[PDB]
Design a protein around this ligand. Sequence first.
Ligand SMILES: [Cl-]
Ligand SMILES: [Cl-]
Ligand SMILES: [Cl-]
Ligand SMILES: [Cl-]
Ligand SMILES: [Cl-]
Ligand SMILES: [Cl-]
Ligand SMILES: [Cl-]
Ligand SMILES: [Cl-]
Lengths: 202, 202, 202, 202, 202, 202, 202, 202
Amino acid sequence: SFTYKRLDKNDAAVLFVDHQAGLLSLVRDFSPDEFKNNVLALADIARFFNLPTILTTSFEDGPNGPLVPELKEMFPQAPYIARPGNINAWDNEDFVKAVKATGKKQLIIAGVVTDVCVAFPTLSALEEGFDVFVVTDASGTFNPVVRDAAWARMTAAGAQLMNWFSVGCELHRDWRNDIEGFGAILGGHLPAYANLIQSFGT
Amino acid sequence: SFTYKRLDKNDAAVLFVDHQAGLLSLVRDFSPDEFKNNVLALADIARFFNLPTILTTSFEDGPNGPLVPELKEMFPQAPYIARPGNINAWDNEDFVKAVKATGKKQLIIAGVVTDVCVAFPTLSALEEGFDVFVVTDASGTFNPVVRDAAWARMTAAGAQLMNWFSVGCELHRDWRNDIEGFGAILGGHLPAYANLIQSFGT
Amino acid sequence: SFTYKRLDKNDAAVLFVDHQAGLLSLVRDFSPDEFKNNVLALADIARFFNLPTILTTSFEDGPNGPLVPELKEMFPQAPYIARPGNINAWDNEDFVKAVKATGKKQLIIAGVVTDVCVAFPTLSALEEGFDVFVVTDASGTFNPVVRDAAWARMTAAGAQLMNWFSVGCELHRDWRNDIEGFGAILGGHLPAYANLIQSFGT
Amino acid sequence: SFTYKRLDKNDAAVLFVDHQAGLLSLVRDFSPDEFKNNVLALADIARFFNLPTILTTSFEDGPNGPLVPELKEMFPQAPYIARPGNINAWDNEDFVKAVKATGKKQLIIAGVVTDVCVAFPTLSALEEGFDVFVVTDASGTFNPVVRDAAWARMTAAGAQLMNWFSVGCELHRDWRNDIEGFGAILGGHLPAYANLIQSFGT
Amino acid sequence: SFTYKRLDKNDAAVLFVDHQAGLLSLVRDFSPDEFKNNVLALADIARFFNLPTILTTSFEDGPNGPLVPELKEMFPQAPYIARPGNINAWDNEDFVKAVKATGKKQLIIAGVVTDVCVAFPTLSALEEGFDVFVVTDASGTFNPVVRDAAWARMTAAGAQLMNWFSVGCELHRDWRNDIEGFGAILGGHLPAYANLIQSFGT
Amino acid sequence: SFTYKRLDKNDAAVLFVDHQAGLLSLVRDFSPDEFKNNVLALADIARFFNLPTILTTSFEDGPNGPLVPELKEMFPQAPYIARPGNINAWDNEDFVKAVKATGKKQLIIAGVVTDVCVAFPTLSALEEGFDVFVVTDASGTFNPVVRDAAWARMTAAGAQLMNWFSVGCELHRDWRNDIEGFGAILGGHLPAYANLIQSFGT
Amino acid sequence: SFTYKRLDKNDAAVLFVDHQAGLLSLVRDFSPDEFKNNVLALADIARFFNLPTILTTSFEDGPNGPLVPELKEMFPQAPYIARPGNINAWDNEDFVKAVKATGKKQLIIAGVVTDVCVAFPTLSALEEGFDVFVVTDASGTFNPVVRDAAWARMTAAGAQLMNWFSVGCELHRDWRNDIEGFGAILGGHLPAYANLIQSFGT
Amino acid sequence: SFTYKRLDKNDAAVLFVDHQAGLLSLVRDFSPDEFKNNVLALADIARFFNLPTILTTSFEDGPNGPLVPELKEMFPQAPYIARPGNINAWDNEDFVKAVKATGKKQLIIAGVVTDVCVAFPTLSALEEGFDVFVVTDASGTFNPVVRDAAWARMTAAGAQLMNWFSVGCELHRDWRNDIEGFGAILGGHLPAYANLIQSFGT
Ligand SMILES: [Cl-]
Ligand SMILES: [Cl-]
Ligand SMILES: [Cl-]
Ligand SMILES: [Cl-]
Ligand SMILES: [Cl-]
Ligand SMILES: [Cl-]
Ligand SMILES: [Cl-]
Ligand SMILES: [Cl-]
């Protein structure tokens, strides 16, 4: 009567949509420090579980600016779709081609801005039957109101709202799978947890 | 399961409901500066995509006051329905006649106050089978609490909660349709984006 | 698909649940000034439309305290069900008997605290087929978090979330029905609107 | 047609998931003072109605830390499942065995963090047909945003969002069942209510 | 050496500066409900101690609007200085004449907006050696930031920042001077205190 | 140019002013849970350092209510001055004599409400040459705005604004004076610190 | 003792410091809409009173970006000091030369960021005996905390904290000097005031 | 009258007081992410300008925990004073000896918690004639209220309130001294500025 459709590290792909230097300037519903940390945390997680990753940008040869250096340094062979025109990434045939090429049913998505560059392909992907998991604290927009409206629209469509930590834990399932490696991610992106690790080590 | 019913510039109409000088005094869930900019942004979008526009007021010959000058000056040829009595604009026969005369299926709506002058005709239009897109940051009310209640009541009815930027982007689809013209709108109503444009130009 | 079940002044009853002198001390999700004004506003509306009203209190001979004086004075002929024990007012046979005696299908409810004394009979009434309209700004509780949880639980059951102003406007329908009388209510409970009325009068 | 599935003191069990000294350091969406009180309030309620209670921890021999002393001391006969690995408590067979051994259909659940250690077994329990009641103010996580996303994910699955006070009142049903005893709980965890009791006593 | 220059009911006068219907719409650093109550609370206090009162307006024959009806009705023989031009009330000779005619050394001042219509005559009066007491919660302005700046400029000049309740209490000194009369003021403007009074009476 | 006048456990007395069951209902600038904890923390500290303590109430045979039980239970033999009339405790001769009987130079003060029952005797005590230390988080009032006004008036007078934790640390000076005894206070009133102690203990 | 040193339109100069496209991205203590409006409001005022204006930029040929076009287009004959190196504008000899060349004693200053590009020359100018008026709502920085610290450092030095509206009123003194002209500024930068003007005009 | 005593890179020393893993858990007036970045930003600055640096801890062999790893790794030759007992670092003779041995007049100070471990030695140092510069965003405490109280006490003693960015810029004076080197610090600790640098590089 209910199915817990949870993230599986063998059934998931990660979509980084338009984390560009210019567009990040528009993000005001998260502080710059927390937002940078959250996006990098999701990125470390995508790497850690060796999930197929897709990078895409919107009009990067204009004021929107280049993709943040970390994402390129980190996934140097991930499909990189520079969209010259299409705002909705799902309207770009090369992007959709890359998504389906992964053969993944679950789509983990984060980007800028939430109400547009994330919501639009989320709604399109849901229409095509994909399970979409939105990393909400790795997605930014103009203000808390715009964010809440975007959440309402995406939940109404059946998207699952999460955060980089809950995404990581649902993928990881069991601490004993890799204690040092997974713990390094938590320590590196949760200063409060890093402190616990240091106190515990004495 | 889910169908992404997105804005089409050939199937949509814009409704400005009761942006009056007096009633705007009641809006406290947005700062006066951000709200004026948001209402003006939606207006530029309505002009830019050649959408049929409808203006309506409630009891403008009383304390509710005249329609704001920007809306009258920008749409001097749009149908203007001054409602002497009916609080729900949909209870006014002239208003519904003008809406149906546009022949549009999608209704983009914004106004004051959100819980009444927007919510009531939204619910009425949804009952008559229209697809309603609520511009949440161009609609104001007494406080965030009343707003959240109005949102809940509208989403329960199947309204799509959006914002002027996401409305504009879903209408535009592709940057290459009109780069300068659309960029002018974003630049004129997103100071953060205007700064990006200026830096890019040197 | 969707049906706009809106308040009708001939099909509605008002339930004031446990606005007691002691319990009001627990309301911290509204300022005392705004909350007192909102409850009195709802009372004026019920009186203005001559709606059948029911008053009920919970353990008033204890720390919960007496019903606030304004409610007793404005509705001296309303059914007054003092519940010595039952926390859910719907578990009281005298209260339910009084509700059905009104013969009303729509129930307008407000009270303290929101998550219990309002939510419980709201959920019970919805189960018995009543259309329930919750006046959210005339219902108080411990904090915004508790309030949001109550909203989530009540909307999930099909309650309609509103506020005293939208309640008033949906009942009144047309300004011309009684301009001075209804305007008196707005003037008396919306200081910003009283200011408009005074400026307009010069 | 809505059915009001309310808590029954003979059909409910309480699950305390990972209220550990280390993990509590991660909770920032509640103040430490209010969060401690809220968890202890839930504990007093579980003791008061003699509800079968289950305690569980996650990797307590690490930085996550030991279970807080109060829960251990207040439920000395409760099943205590120390999970060495599984992040989702429902993936632990000893935990699930203990839950089903109570023979209770309704699960009252609280823990840290909300988006993971509460949400994951909540979704799992719902999948196995349990009615789940989430004590939201006795569950903590990193920030209000992550909390809201967890709420969205849990309501979409049919979990009921509540708080310790509403849990207590729905369990208690009638004040006359135990005036002194139930009032002691409210007095002990609602400082405002303790004050009412003291004034009333003079 | 510090001297506690406290309010004396025989050496104080009250100045209401520009509480006009139009200007009040500019006040956003207080909710409309709490601000109306606070200004009326201050007015009740001025009445209770028979303090010499001065009313003044700024360009009331324009958009600024008339003085609120409550103030004219409550001090009908108090000096009423309608300033056609001077923004700083102290630049108006009739106003200064009326102040000095009271022969009072202590000046209690409140008005709209705080940073201008209150701050300017406050700074001027301080220059002339008057002891100035600013009722901060009966003075409004555009936003909290502007208010804090206004406070900073006034404390730097030696103004004493207070609120209507502390003003009332410093004037009253002893409860036994008039228990019923003074308690009536607190009950009428402190809903929480009204609740205490009602519970105490049973 | 500056002297660090810090608390000396042989030169200080603690004044609890009007922590009464009724008046506490007026406190809205702190949550009930954090405020109760802070007042009790200050109280444990006064006992721990064996400081002469004075309890005083304002009109306790009325709606103001009795002194909170914890204070009487902990300081049953402390001077208790029940003021029937004087709002400023310093205008009560019995209170002042009880203060001077201590022979202490430093006065540590906390109470309700901050802008009156704390501020007034604070300003009076400063006038008589006492060094006054205000425990800001153990003093409550109507809202943060009124609080900020009271702080401004007190610092201008030379009061030192502190909190219960800094009061204790300045009194204690050295951890090694009593590690367990002082640690019990921190553990008992700082849940985050209690958690540290528990993790450290494994 | 105290002297009310108020702005005189014949003794004041305006300093716009580093309102550059890049640096504006760092301003998060104001929304972009309100901040853009405030800076332009200050600009309109300087133009309106024909105050000598100085524009200066910091390393504009780098990431800091060009001066915003509005400032350039409204003060085409103002001194433009592009500082390649000096962070403190007062460390630039050309800038100081231009300031003294105006022969103005009162300095009205605004810029980005507040704690550095405004604070540093503010403190330097105060050291040289200038009276400095800081337009707080036309100066931006990283967050409210940094802002408050900057205010603290500047007030301690004797700077007068103001906002663009109070600056305008203190320069203007009298409404009758230019009703149309001055009202145009208020209407153009205070939307609520524009609404009053429109309502008044019918 | 006023002297601008600004930081000189040849007359300043940096004091890191008690940034310990356990104690950092008490910091709730900053998010963990921004606070870690701020503390690390100050450390990069201390190193960049080759400032004499002093590290000190409080009871690090208890629940307070070890000094955070970043500080020890960065400054292996800095004086490290582990205080077993004294809460005020200035009461430790080794600490005072280490400070005076630097021969610096200006003290840049940061630590945990603000109201005690920073405030106490700040007040002591001010008493001995040092110029103290408090890095407010690299100092944390329990909540914003306690923070504001600590600021008041420090400013009253003549402390200068600052932030790491303003500290860096006042030390740096001129961009051209080291463009690349200083830009690395800003890029590394101001995500928004890193974005500007990347956009500029294209
Ligand atoms: Cl494309
Ligand atoms: Cl009509
Ligand atoms: Cl009953
Ligand atoms: Cl396990
Ligand atoms: Cl005049
Ligand atoms: Cl007395
Ligand atoms: Cl230069
Ligand atoms: Cl020591």
